[PDB]
């Protein structure tokens, strides 16, 4: 039966989850809740029958595991080294990349971290020169994790910065072509 | 002839300008520029023939003055006290309201200022109990200034907070019904 995601469609943490659900072809509903089993009262929340989860990354990994197939294996947990590189780049996204983007997005879309971001992008350029995707020659949760914040960065007048890092630009365009990513990009709008 | 706004449609500072341009029925174009006459290299920028402006509030006041009519007088500059209350509430928006909203928007849509915002909303509730709009019994630039950040607040799970302040809720619904506001709300999406 269908699973439910609770939170705003355009939130970076909700988009992470909805992107995983689209990649694995799961049936799901997104429910817009107002703050008036989930002990910190956090959003996004996720229901799968009697299971209630929170923490966007934990919810995402549950989706990627539950719906895993031979053709859609985005954690690589049966290959120790591939799974390690998925985990490394998932943590680079959390600790290094999203913090380099986030204040440029905030500044620009709701009134000089550029030099820090250029240093990050140099490393990404080098990695994506050697490999198709961040964890190796396969798409993974590491790449998907980069979608939501980068999508908002691409709405700012700093979007063209990626043109100085041609392998990063090509990797970004590759993720943007994925049908699941296109579907979720379209959902990332305020409610109407 | 048409005027040009340079910047991202969904930016709060661009939406301020585009809302003014819609309210006065001006012909205009929005141009998405990348950072690669305007001495700080700021966005939004605004061109009207040979005139180049920057600073979203200055651009907005220029639009409201240039296109002013008897029926669309949103600064009230011919009435000293009305113009004063427009200015007071424009500065309340900048100094008190947008700072109470902004970190709730940031937190929620890109990972406890609620109690400060509730104190602000108490004052708004009292003001909008006495008057239809913030500056008096007429819509003004003071009200329009509240649209962009509040629109993003209304995408968060804290949207229902306004239900505790029924005059503020009704004032917000009134602005949301304005045809110009509906038009600009629809534009506040990432580029496709």
CSV table of C-alpha atoms in Angstrom, one decimal:
chain,number,residue,atom,x,y,z
A,1,UNK,CA,0.0,0.0,0.0
A,2,UNK,CA,1.1,3.7,-0.3
A,3,UNK,CA,3.5,5.4,2.2
A,4,UNK,CA,3.0,9.1,3.3
A,5,UNK,CA,5.5,12.0,3.6
A,6,UNK,CA,4.5,14.8,5.9
A,7,UNK,CA,5.9,18.3,5.1
A,8,UNK,CA,6.3,21.0,2.6
A,9,UNK,CA,7.0,19.8,-1.0
A,10,UNK,CA,9.6,22.5,-1.6
A,11,UNK,CA,11.6,21.9,1.7
A,12,UNK,CA,15.1,20.5,1.0
A,13,UNK,CA,14.5,17.7,3.6
A,14,UNK,CA,11.2,16.7,2.1
A,15,UNK,CA,12.5,16.8,-1.5
A,16,UNK,CA,15.4,14.4,-0.4
A,17,UNK,CA,12.7,11.9,0.6
A,18,UNK,CA,10.4,12.4,-2.4
A,19,UNK,CA,13.3,12.1,-4.7
A,20,UNK,CA,14.2,8.7,-3.2
A,21,UNK,CA,10.6,7.6,-3.4
A,22,UNK,CA,10.5,8.6,-7.1
A,23,UNK,CA,13.8,6.9,-7.9
A,24,UNK,CA,12.6,3.5,-6.5
A,25,UNK,CA,9.1,3.9,-8.1
A,26,UNK,CA,7.2,3.7,-4.8
A,27,UNK,CA,3.6,4.7,-4.4
A,28,UNK,CA,3.4,7.6,-2.0
A,29,UNK,CA,1.4,10.7,-0.9
A,30,UNK,CA,2.8,14.1,0.3
A,31,UNK,CA,0.6,15.7,3.0
A,32,UNK,CA,1.0,19.3,3.9
A,33,UNK,CA,0.8,19.4,7.8
A,34,UNK,CA,0.6,22.5,10.1
A,35,UNK,CA,2.3,22.1,13.6
A,36,UNK,CA,-1.2,22.0,15.2
A,37,UNK,CA,5.9,8.1,17.7
A,38,UNK,CA,7.5,11.5,16.6
A,39,UNK,CA,8.8,12.7,19.9
A,40,UNK,CA,10.6,15.9,18.8
A,41,UNK,CA,7.5,16.9,16.6
A,42,UNK,CA,9.8,17.0,13.5
A,43,UNK,CA,9.0,17.4,9.8
A,44,UNK,CA,9.4,15.7,7.5
A,45,UNK,CA,7.7,12.7,9.0
A,46,UNK,CA,7.0,9.4,7.1
A,47,UNK,CA,4.4,6.7,7.7
A,48,UNK,CA,4.6,3.2,6.3
A,49,UNK,CA,1.6,1.3,7.8
A,50,UNK,CA,2.3,1.2,11.5
A,51,UNK,CA,5.9,2.5,11.1
A,52,UNK,CA,6.5,6.3,11.8
A,53,UNK,CA,9.9,7.7,10.9
A,54,UNK,CA,11.6,11.1,11.1
A,55,UNK,CA,15.0,12.4,10.1
A,56,UNK,CA,15.1,13.0,6.4
A,57,UNK,CA,18.3,10.9,5.8
A,58,UNK,CA,17.0,7.9,7.9
A,59,UNK,CA,13.6,8.0,6.0
A,60,UNK,CA,15.5,8.2,2.7
A,61,UNK,CA,17.7,5.1,3.5
A,62,UNK,CA,14.6,3.2,4.6
A,63,UNK,CA,13.0,3.9,1.2
A,64,UNK,CA,16.1,3.0,-0.8
A,65,UNK,CA,16.5,-0.3,1.1
A,66,UNK,CA,12.8,-1.3,1.2
A,67,UNK,CA,12.4,-0.8,-2.6
A,68,UNK,CA,15.9,-1.9,-3.6
A,69,UNK,CA,16.2,-3.9,-6.9
A,70,UNK,CA,19.2,-5.1,-9.0
A,71,UNK,CA,18.5,-2.1,-11.4
A,72,UNK,CA,17.9,0.4,-8.5
A,73,UNK,CA,20.5,-0.1,-5.8
A,74,UNK,CA,21.4,3.3,-4.6
A,75,UNK,CA,23.2,2.4,-1.3
A,76,UNK,CA,25.4,-0.5,-2.7
A,77,UNK,CA,25.3,-2.1,0.8
A,78,UNK,CA,26.3,-5.6,-0.7
A,79,UNK,CA,29.6,-4.0,-1.9
A,80,UNK,CA,31.7,-2.8,1.1
A,81,UNK,CA,33.9,-0.3,-0.8
A,82,UNK,CA,31.1,1.1,-3.0
A,83,UNK,CA,28.9,1.5,0.1
A,84,UNK,CA,31.9,3.3,1.8
A,85,UNK,CA,32.2,5.8,-1.1
A,86,UNK,CA,28.4,6.4,-1.0
A,87,UNK,CA,28.7,7.1,2.7
A,88,UNK,CA,31.8,9.4,2.3
A,89,UNK,CA,30.2,11.6,-0.3
A,90,UNK,CA,26.8,11.7,1.6
A,91,UNK,CA,28.8,13.1,4.6
A,92,UNK,CA,30.8,15.5,2.3
A,93,UNK,CA,27.3,16.8,1.2
A,94,UNK,CA,26.2,17.3,4.8
A,95,UNK,CA,29.5,18.7,6.2
A,96,UNK,CA,31.2,20.6,3.3
A,97,UNK,CA,28.9,21.1,0.3
A,98,UNK,CA,25.5,22.1,1.7
A,99,UNK,CA,27.2,24.6,4.1
A,100,UNK,CA,29.1,26.3,1.3
A,101,UNK,CA,25.9,26.7,-0.8
A,102,UNK,CA,23.3,27.4,1.9
A,103,UNK,CA,24.1,31.1,2.9
A,104,UNK,CA,24.5,32.1,-0.8
A,105,UNK,CA,20.9,30.6,-1.4
A,106,UNK,CA,19.6,32.4,1.8
A,107,UNK,CA,21.3,35.7,1.0
A,108,UNK,CA,20.2,35.7,-2.7
A,109,UNK,CA,16.6,34.5,-2.4
A,110,UNK,CA,15.8,36.2,1.0
A,111,UNK,CA,18.3,39.2,1.9
A,112,UNK,CA,31.0,36.0,0.3
A,113,UNK,CA,31.0,32.2,0.9
A,114,UNK,CA,31.9,32.1,-2.9
A,115,UNK,CA,35.6,31.6,-2.3
A,116,UNK,CA,34.9,28.6,0.1
A,117,UNK,CA,32.4,27.2,-2.5
A,118,UNK,CA,35.0,27.5,-5.3
A,119,UNK,CA,37.5,25.5,-3.1
A,120,UNK,CA,34.8,22.8,-2.6
A,121,UNK,CA,34.0,22.8,-6.4
A,122,UNK,CA,37.7,22.3,-7.2
A,123,UNK,CA,37.6,19.0,-5.3
A,124,UNK,CA,34.3,18.0,-6.9
A,125,UNK,CA,35.8,18.8,-10.4
A,126,UNK,CA,38.8,16.5,-9.6
A,127,UNK,CA,36.5,13.7,-8.3
A,128,UNK,CA,34.1,13.9,-11.2
A,129,UNK,CA,37.0,13.9,-13.7
A,130,UNK,CA,37.9,10.4,-12.5
A,131,UNK,CA,34.4,9.0,-12.0
A,132,UNK,CA,30.9,9.4,-13.6
A,133,UNK,CA,29.3,10.0,-10.2
A,134,UNK,CA,30.6,10.9,-6.7
A,135,UNK,CA,30.7,7.3,-5.3
A,136,UNK,CA,32.1,5.7,-8.5
A,137,UNK,CA,30.8,4.9,-12.0
A,138,UNK,CA,27.1,4.5,-10.7
A,139,UNK,CA,24.5,6.9,-9.5
A,140,UNK,CA,23.9,6.7,-5.7
A,141,UNK,CA,22.3,8.3,-2.7
A,142,UNK,CA,25.5,10.5,-2.5
A,143,UNK,CA,24.5,12.2,-5.8
A,144,UNK,CA,20.8,12.4,-4.9
A,145,UNK,CA,21.7,14.2,-1.6
A,146,UNK,CA,23.2,17.0,-3.7
A,147,UNK,CA,20.0,17.7,-5.6
A,148,UNK,CA,17.8,19.9,-3.3
A,149,UNK,CA,20.3,22.6,-2.2
A,150,UNK,CA,21.9,22.7,-5.6
A,151,UNK,CA,18.5,23.2,-7.3
A,152,UNK,CA,18.0,26.4,-5.2
A,153,UNK,CA,21.5,27.5,-5.9
A,154,UNK,CA,20.7,27.2,-9.6
A,155,UNK,CA,17.9,29.8,-9.0
A,156,UNK,CA,20.4,32.4,-7.9
A,157,UNK,CA,22.5,34.7,-10.1
A,158,UNK,CA,25.6,32.5,-9.0
A,159,UNK,CA,24.2,29.5,-11.0
A,160,UNK,CA,26.9,30.1,-13.8
A,161,UNK,CA,29.7,29.5,-11.2
A,162,UNK,CA,29.4,25.8,-12.1
A,163,UNK,CA,30.5,26.6,-15.7
A,164,UNK,CA,34.1,27.1,-14.3
A,165,UNK,CA,34.0,23.4,-13.2
A,166,UNK,CA,33.0,21.6,-16.4
A,167,UNK,CA,32.8,18.0,-14.9
A,168,UNK,CA,30.7,19.3,-12.0
A,169,UNK,CA,28.4,21.1,-14.5
A,170,UNK,CA,28.1,17.9,-16.6
A,171,UNK,CA,27.3,15.8,-13.5
A,172,UNK,CA,24.7,18.4,-12.4
A,173,UNK,CA,23.1,18.3,-15.9
A,174,UNK,CA,23.1,14.5,-15.8
A,175,UNK,CA,21.2,14.5,-12.4
A,176,UNK,CA,18.8,17.2,-13.8
A,177,UNK,CA,18.0,14.9,-16.7
A,178,UNK,CA,16.9,12.0,-14.5
A,179,UNK,CA,13.1,11.5,-14.8
A,180,UNK,CA,12.7,11.3,-11.0
A,181,UNK,CA,14.7,14.5,-10.5
A,182,UNK,CA,12.6,16.3,-13.1
A,183,UNK,CA,9.4,15.1,-11.4
A,184,UNK,CA,10.6,16.4,-7.9
A,185,UNK,CA,12.0,19.7,-9.3
A,186,UNK,CA,8.5,20.4,-10.6
A,187,UNK,CA,7.0,19.8,-7.1
A,188,UNK,CA,9.4,22.2,-5.4
A,189,UNK,CA,7.0,25.2,-5.4
A,190,UNK,CA,5.1,27.0,-2.7
A,191,UNK,CA,1.5,25.6,-2.2
A,192,UNK,CA,-1.3,27.1,-4.5
B,1,UNK,CA,8.2,51.7,-23.3
B,2,UNK,CA,8.8,48.7,-21.0
B,3,UNK,CA,11.0,48.7,-18.0
B,4,UNK,CA,13.3,45.8,-17.0
B,5,UNK,CA,13.9,44.0,-13.7
B,6,UNK,CA,17.0,42.0,-13.4
B,7,UNK,CA,17.1,39.1,-10.9
B,8,UNK,CA,15.4,35.8,-9.9
B,9,UNK,CA,11.5,35.9,-10.0
B,10,UNK,CA,11.3,34.0,-6.7
B,11,UNK,CA,13.7,36.3,-4.7
B,12,UNK,CA,11.9,38.3,-2.0
B,13,UNK,CA,13.6,41.6,-3.2
B,14,UNK,CA,12.6,40.9,-6.9
B,15,UNK,CA,9.0,40.0,-5.9
B,16,UNK,CA,8.7,43.3,-4.0
B,17,UNK,CA,9.5,45.2,-7.3
B,18,UNK,CA,7.4,43.0,-9.6
B,19,UNK,CA,4.5,43.3,-7.2
B,20,UNK,CA,4.7,47.1,-7.4
B,21,UNK,CA,4.9,46.9,-11.2
B,22,UNK,CA,1.8,44.7,-11.3
B,23,UNK,CA,-0.1,46.9,-8.9
B,24,UNK,CA,0.4,50.0,-11.1
B,25,UNK,CA,-0.2,48.1,-14.4
B,26,UNK,CA,3.3,48.9,-15.8
B,27,UNK,CA,4.7,47.1,-18.8
B,28,UNK,CA,7.9,45.3,-17.7
B,29,UNK,CA,10.2,42.3,-18.3
B,30,UNK,CA,12.0,40.2,-15.8
B,31,UNK,CA,15.5,39.1,-16.9
B,32,UNK,CA,17.3,36.3,-15.2
B,33,UNK,CA,21.0,37.4,-15.0
B,34,UNK,CA,24.1,35.6,-13.8
B,35,UNK,CA,26.8,37.6,-12.0
B,36,UNK,CA,29.1,37.2,-15.2
B,37,UNK,CA,25.7,52.5,-13.1
B,38,UNK,CA,25.4,49.5,-10.6
B,39,UNK,CA,28.6,50.1,-8.6
B,40,UNK,CA,28.0,47.3,-5.9
B,41,UNK,CA,27.0,44.8,-8.6
B,42,UNK,CA,23.7,44.3,-6.8
B,43,UNK,CA,20.5,42.4,-7.8
B,44,UNK,CA,17.7,43.3,-8.3
B,45,UNK,CA,18.7,46.0,-10.8
B,46,UNK,CA,16.1,48.0,-12.7
B,47,UNK,CA,16.4,49.8,-16.1
B,48,UNK,CA,14.0,52.5,-17.3
B,49,UNK,CA,15.5,53.8,-20.5
B,50,UNK,CA,18.8,55.4,-19.5
B,51,UNK,CA,18.0,55.2,-15.8
B,52,UNK,CA,19.6,52.2,-13.9
B,53,UNK,CA,18.4,51.7,-10.3
B,54,UNK,CA,19.3,49.2,-7.5
B,55,UNK,CA,18.0,48.7,-4.0
B,56,UNK,CA,14.7,46.9,-4.1
B,57,UNK,CA,12.8,49.5,-1.9
B,58,UNK,CA,14.2,52.5,-3.9
B,59,UNK,CA,13.2,50.7,-7.2
B,60,UNK,CA,9.7,50.0,-5.8
B,61,UNK,CA,9.1,53.6,-4.7
B,62,UNK,CA,10.2,54.8,-8.1
B,63,UNK,CA,7.7,52.5,-9.7
B,64,UNK,CA,4.9,53.6,-7.3
B,65,UNK,CA,5.6,57.3,-8.0
B,66,UNK,CA,6.2,57.1,-11.7
B,67,UNK,CA,2.9,55.2,-12.4
B,68,UNK,CA,0.8,56.8,-9.6
B,69,UNK,CA,-2.9,57.6,-10.4
B,70,UNK,CA,-5.8,58.8,-8.3
B,71,UNK,CA,-7.0,55.1,-8.0
B,72,UNK,CA,-3.5,53.7,-7.5
B,73,UNK,CA,-1.7,55.9,-4.9
B,74,UNK,CA,0.2,53.5,-2.8
B,75,UNK,CA,2.7,56.0,-1.0
B,76,UNK,CA,0.0,58.7,-0.2
B,77,UNK,CA,2.8,61.4,-0.5
B,78,UNK,CA,0.2,64.2,-0.9
B,79,UNK,CA,-1.2,63.4,2.6
B,80,UNK,CA,1.5,64.0,5.3
B,81,UNK,CA,0.0,61.7,8.0
B,82,UNK,CA,-1.1,58.9,5.6
B,83,UNK,CA,2.5,59.0,4.1
B,84,UNK,CA,3.9,58.9,7.7
B,85,UNK,CA,1.9,55.7,8.5
B,86,UNK,CA,3.0,54.1,5.2
B,87,UNK,CA,6.6,54.8,6.1
B,88,UNK,CA,6.2,53.7,9.8
B,89,UNK,CA,4.8,50.2,8.8
B,90,UNK,CA,7.3,49.9,5.9
B,91,UNK,CA,10.1,50.3,8.6
B,92,UNK,CA,8.2,47.9,11.0
B,93,UNK,CA,8.3,45.3,8.1
B,94,UNK,CA,12.1,45.8,7.6
B,95,UNK,CA,13.1,46.0,11.3
B,96,UNK,CA,10.6,43.9,13.2
B,97,UNK,CA,8.4,41.6,11.0
B,98,UNK,CA,10.8,40.2,8.3
B,99,UNK,CA,13.4,39.4,11.0
B,100,UNK,CA,10.8,37.5,13.1
B,101,UNK,CA,9.7,35.4,10.0
B,102,UNK,CA,13.0,34.9,8.1
B,103,UNK,CA,14.8,32.3,10.3
B,104,UNK,CA,11.6,30.2,10.6
B,105,UNK,CA,11.4,30.2,6.8
B,106,UNK,CA,15.2,29.4,6.4
B,107,UNK,CA,15.1,26.6,9.1
B,108,UNK,CA,11.9,25.0,7.7
B,109,UNK,CA,12.5,25.1,4.0
B,110,UNK,CA,16.4,24.6,4.2
B,111,UNK,CA,17.5,23.0,7.6
B,112,UNK,CA,12.4,29.0,18.2
B,113,UNK,CA,11.8,32.6,16.9
B,114,UNK,CA,8.0,31.6,17.3
B,115,UNK,CA,7.7,33.4,20.6
B,116,UNK,CA,9.2,36.7,19.2
B,117,UNK,CA,6.8,36.3,16.1
B,118,UNK,CA,3.8,35.8,18.4
B,119,UNK,CA,4.7,39.1,20.2
B,120,UNK,CA,4.9,40.8,16.8
B,121,UNK,CA,1.6,39.3,15.6
B,122,UNK,CA,-0.1,40.6,18.9
B,123,UNK,CA,0.8,44.1,17.8
B,124,UNK,CA,-0.3,43.5,14.2
B,125,UNK,CA,-3.6,42.0,15.5
B,126,UNK,CA,-4.3,45.2,17.5
B,127,UNK,CA,-3.4,47.5,14.6
B,128,UNK,CA,-5.6,45.5,12.0
B,129,UNK,CA,-8.5,45.5,14.5
B,130,UNK,CA,-8.6,49.3,14.3
B,131,UNK,CA,-7.8,49.7,10.5
B,132,UNK,CA,-8.4,47.7,7.3
B,133,UNK,CA,-4.7,47.9,6.4
B,134,UNK,CA,-1.5,48.8,8.2
B,135,UNK,CA,-1.3,52.5,7.3
B,136,UNK,CA,-5.0,53.2,7.6
B,137,UNK,CA,-8.2,52.3,5.7
B,138,UNK,CA,-6.3,52.0,2.4
B,139,UNK,CA,-3.9,49.5,0.9
B,140,UNK,CA,-0.3,50.9,0.6
B,141,UNK,CA,3.3,50.0,0.0
B,142,UNK,CA,3.4,49.1,3.8
B,143,UNK,CA,1.1,46.1,3.1
B,144,UNK,CA,2.8,45.1,-0.2
B,145,UNK,CA,6.2,45.0,1.6
B,146,UNK,CA,4.8,42.2,3.9
B,147,UNK,CA,3.9,39.9,0.9
B,148,UNK,CA,7.1,38.2,-0.2
B,149,UNK,CA,8.5,36.9,3.2
B,150,UNK,CA,5.0,36.1,4.5
B,151,UNK,CA,4.3,34.1,1.3
B,152,UNK,CA,7.3,31.8,2.1
B,153,UNK,CA,6.2,31.6,5.8
B,154,UNK,CA,2.8,30.3,4.5
B,155,UNK,CA,4.7,27.4,2.8
B,156,UNK,CA,6.0,26.2,6.2
B,157,UNK,CA,4.2,24.1,8.8
B,158,UNK,CA,3.9,27.3,10.9
B,159,UNK,CA,1.4,28.8,8.4
B,160,UNK,CA,-1.6,28.1,10.8
B,161,UNK,CA,0.0,30.4,13.5
B,162,UNK,CA,-1.9,33.3,11.8
B,163,UNK,CA,-5.2,31.6,12.7
B,164,UNK,CA,-4.5,32.7,16.4
B,165,UNK,CA,-4.6,36.4,15.1
B,166,UNK,CA,-7.9,36.6,13.2
B,167,UNK,CA,-7.5,40.2,12.0
B,168,UNK,CA,-3.9,39.4,10.7
B,169,UNK,CA,-5.3,36.3,9.0
B,170,UNK,CA,-8.1,38.3,7.3
B,171,UNK,CA,-5.6,41.0,6.2
B,172,UNK,CA,-3.3,38.4,4.8
B,173,UNK,CA,-6.2,36.7,2.9
B,174,UNK,CA,-7.2,40.2,1.6
B,175,UNK,CA,-3.7,40.8,0.2
B,176,UNK,CA,-3.6,37.2,-1.3
B,177,UNK,CA,-6.9,38.0,-3.2
B,178,UNK,CA,-5.4,41.0,-4.9
B,179,UNK,CA,-5.0,40.2,-8.6
B,180,UNK,CA,-1.5,41.6,-8.7
B,181,UNK,CA,-0.5,39.5,-5.6
B,182,UNK,CA,-1.9,36.4,-7.2
B,183,UNK,CA,0.0,37.1,-10.4
B,184,UNK,CA,3.3,37.6,-8.6
B,185,UNK,CA,2.7,34.6,-6.2
B,186,UNK,CA,2.5,32.4,-9.4
B,187,UNK,CA,5.9,33.8,-10.6
B,188,UNK,CA,7.7,32.9,-7.3
B,189,UNK,CA,9.1,29.5,-8.5
B,190,UNK,CA,12.6,28.3,-9.4
B,191,UNK,CA,13.4,28.6,-13.2
B,192,UNK,CA,12.3,25.7,-15.5
